[PDB]
């Protein structure tokens, strides 16, 4: 919804919110490293490099969902960061449990997001 509304405007700034939902078995466990790279740098090449920047280590067996907050993005008439998801650990399951699962990523704006110069959308 934030992606669709931003196309009706020319300039926006503020903090975003990304939520990850793990939808594997209750018995499935493991760790993902969720890393945010600010707009300056490129995509990290290794999990070791991603661990040095802003990151979250996410355990499936403890929390089904984690919220990542991007401190600031902006656009003008893109200067955007990058989110990378790394395999911190192997995907671990007991026997008779599916070894494949899915992550659902949700996106939203924070209370400090704003929009400037209303502009017709190019979607339609």
């Amino acid at each position: 919804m934030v992606g669709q509304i931003c196309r009706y405007y020319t300039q926006w700034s503020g903090s975003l919110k990304v939520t990850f939902m793990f939808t594997g078995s209750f018995m499935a466990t493991g760790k993902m490293l969720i890393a945010y790279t600010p707009p300056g740098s490129a995509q990290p090449t290794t999990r070791e490099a991603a661990m040095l920047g802003t990151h979250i280590v996410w355990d499936f067996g403890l929390q089904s969902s984690v919220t990542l907050v991007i401190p600031w993005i902006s656009n003008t008439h893109y200067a955007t960061g990058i989110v990378t998801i790394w395999y911190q650990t192997n995907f671990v399951v007991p026997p008779d449990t599916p070894s494949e699962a899915n992550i659902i990523a949700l996106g939203a704006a924070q209370e400090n997001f704003t929009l400037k110069l209303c502009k017709d959308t190019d979607e339609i």
């Binding site: 919804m1 939808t23 899915n102």
Partner: protein
């Protein structure tokens, strides 16, 4: 735990000019009870289901009697969606309440108009043809602006949504206008290993809230 749609508790309609001369009927537990629909089998290839309200209860019990034999109707709903899955089952369901859920037809690239079985599926409900666009040309990804609850099989197996009466009119015809649609869409498909039950039951329980009827025929 309980999703209150639009932060609005269902309630009886304020004084109306039409309802002042003849006070509307407010039925009790006899009508406002729990109705348990037929269970839906969630399978790997399932695309999801939707129900129209109050079309789902229009031919069921005393509520169906009041709905058919009254000219005007107004009610909120308390809907419970429950799953019966083992801890060895995985999948995610989205339970969404869509006000004025107008179902679109799909024209081959010519059916431009959905049939009565799709617009008014009854108590059995209808399966989605294109859950990606909610069968209405609007993206499923943005369907979270509507009141909704997630059913992630690894965290929770039940969802409760309380939907108040939402209409441009204080009353309307139950038999020919559906106030909202309730859609259950598997986002993450059901997965399991050999020897588990191949389907996850999905049970919809409905309780009318503050039902009002006018002009008994």
């Amino acid at each position: 735990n309980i999703v209150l749609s639009y932060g609005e508790w269902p309630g009886y309609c304020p004084s109306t000019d039409a309802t002042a001369v003849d006070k509307p009927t407010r039925p009790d537990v006899s009508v406002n009870r729990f109705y348990t629909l037929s269970t839906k089998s969630w399978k790997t290839e399932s695309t999801g289901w939707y129900w129209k309200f109050p079309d789902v209860l229009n031919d069921t019990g005393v509520f169906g009697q009041n709905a058919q034999f009254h000219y005007l109707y107004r009610s909120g709903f308390c809907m419970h969606v429950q799953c019966n899955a083992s801890k060895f089952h995985q999948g995610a369901l989205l339970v969404v309440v869509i006000p004025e859920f107008v179902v679109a037809a799909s024209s081959p690239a010519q059916g431009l108009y959905p049939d009565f079985a799709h617009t008014n599926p009854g108590k059995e409900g209808q399966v989605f043809r294109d859950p990606y666009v909610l069968d209405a040309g609007i993206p499923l990804s943005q369907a979270l602006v509507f009141p909704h609850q997630w059913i992630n099989l690894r965290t929770n197996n039940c969802a409760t949504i309380i939907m108040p009466y939402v209409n441009a009119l204080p009353f309307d015809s139950a038999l020919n206008h559906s106030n909202f649609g309730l859609a259950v869409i598997p986002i993450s498909p059901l997965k399991y290993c050999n020897g588990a039950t191949t389907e996850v039951p999905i049970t919809l329980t409905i309780a009318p809230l503050n039902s009002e009827f006018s002009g008994l025929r």
